[PDB]
Amino acid sequence: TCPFYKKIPGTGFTVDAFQYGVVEGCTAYFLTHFHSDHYAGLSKHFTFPVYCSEITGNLLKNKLHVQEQYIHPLPLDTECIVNGVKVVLLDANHCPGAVMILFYLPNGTVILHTGDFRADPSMERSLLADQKVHMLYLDTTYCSPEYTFPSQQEVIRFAINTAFEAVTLNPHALVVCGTYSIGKEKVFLAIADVLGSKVGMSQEKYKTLQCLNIPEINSLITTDMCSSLVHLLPMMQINFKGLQSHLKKCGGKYNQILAFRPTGWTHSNKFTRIADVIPQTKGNISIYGIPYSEHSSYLEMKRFVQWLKPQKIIPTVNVGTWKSRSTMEKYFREWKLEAGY
Numbered sequence: 323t324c325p326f327y328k329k330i331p332g333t334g335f336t337v338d339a340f341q342y343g344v345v346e347g348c349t350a351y352f353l354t355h356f357h358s359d360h361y362a363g364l365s366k367h368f369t370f371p372v373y374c375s376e377i378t379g380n381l382l383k384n385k386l387h388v389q390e391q392y393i394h395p396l397p398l399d400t401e402c403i404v405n406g407v408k409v410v411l412l413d414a415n416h417c418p419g420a421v422m423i424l425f426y427l428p429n430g431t432v433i434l435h436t437g438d439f440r441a442d443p444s445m446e447r448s449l450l451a452d453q454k455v456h457m458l459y460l461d462t463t464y465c466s467p468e469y470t471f472p473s474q475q476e477v478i479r480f481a482i483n484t485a486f487e488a489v490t491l492n493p494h495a496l497v498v499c500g501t502y503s504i505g506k507e508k509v510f511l512a513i514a515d516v517l518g519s520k521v522g523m524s525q526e527k528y529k530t531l532q533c534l535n536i537p538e539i540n541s542l543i544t545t546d547m548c549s550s551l552v553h554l555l556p557m558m559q560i561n562f563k564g565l566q567s568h569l570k571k572c573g574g575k576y577n578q579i580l581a582f583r584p585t586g587w588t589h590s591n592k593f594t595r596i597a598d599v600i601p602q603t604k605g606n607i608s609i610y611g612i613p614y615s616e617h618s619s620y621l622e623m624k625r626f627v628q629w630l631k632p633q634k635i636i637p638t639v640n641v642g643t644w645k646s647r648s649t650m651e652k653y654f655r656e657w658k659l660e661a662g663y
């Protein structure tokens with residue numbers, strides 16, 4: 323059955339709750355972003371109102387064939403009324419189209435649901451600054467102090483310099499980037515830009531990218547793999563066997579692959595600096611695991627919550643084990659005592 327942390331009290335609303343059948347007494351289903359653990363259950367047969375961003379609405383219409391009449395896109399940073407309740411969508415700094423949702427309950431309670439987010443100080447200057455939040459439904463994916471990672475900017479710098487050096491030393495090297503969902507587009511777009519290439523990809527992936535309102539996208543992407551030296555492949559194919567195979571398919575146009583796997587976190591972060599990352603190499607194939615995250619680090623998440631000062635926190639991630647739940651609760655208490663709320 324639908325867990326309590328997907329229900330918004332004092333409303334008929336649920337968040338990211340599409341895999342439970344008909345939720346009893348739900349009058350509107352909100353979708354924070356187009357990732358499969360969150361949309362799981364939607365299709366052309368869904369007949370209840372879905373509230374989301376424009377971008378997420380483009381993906382629902384074109385990738386899952388949800389019918390237009392049940393898609394209710396909302397503009398960002400705008401007070402809107404949904405079944406008699408004021409709501410605002412804010413940018414979550416996650417993947418394209420991902421939002422946080424502010425609910426203003428008729429009784430005066432104010433609820434923020436972060437969906438998935440990467441907290442940023444820029445959030446401290448949105449419509450969040452304007453009123454108090456009583457309950458926070460928090461993306462706790464990396465809510466433990468071992469999770470440190472670099473900025474997105476530092477990671478992209480590393481990738482661009484790496485790719486540019488390699489191809490300039492060997493103009494017959496191919497660059498490959500892995501993907502399994504939307505998000506992380508900067509990785510492959512930034513590399514293609516420095517190399518003067520388009521990114522080549524499957525028709526299905528090109529279709530997905532065309533739903534995202536990215537400026538000048540027709541100029542950065544293509545389905546002609548032959549004309550491209552940056553190729554996008556499914557994440558599963560980013561291994562020595564899948565890459566050797568791919569290289570065969572290029573018909574002696576290339577003699578070396580440099581591949582990138584943008585992971586969330588990996589334990590080399592506790593020790594290693596971004597400056598100090600090295601690939602795994604086999605023959606003429608090298609694979610770089612880079613820590614490009616679209617979720618908050620522990621320190622980013624802590625700063626956000628200590629700024630917001632919510633009266634109650636409801637975690638939405640890592641809730642399935644008692645040891646996880648109890649450890650998170652302990653962090654929340656520390657943060658509250660250190661900050662004085």
Ligand code: NI
Nearest residue numbers: 355357416438
């Ligand atoms: Ni996500």
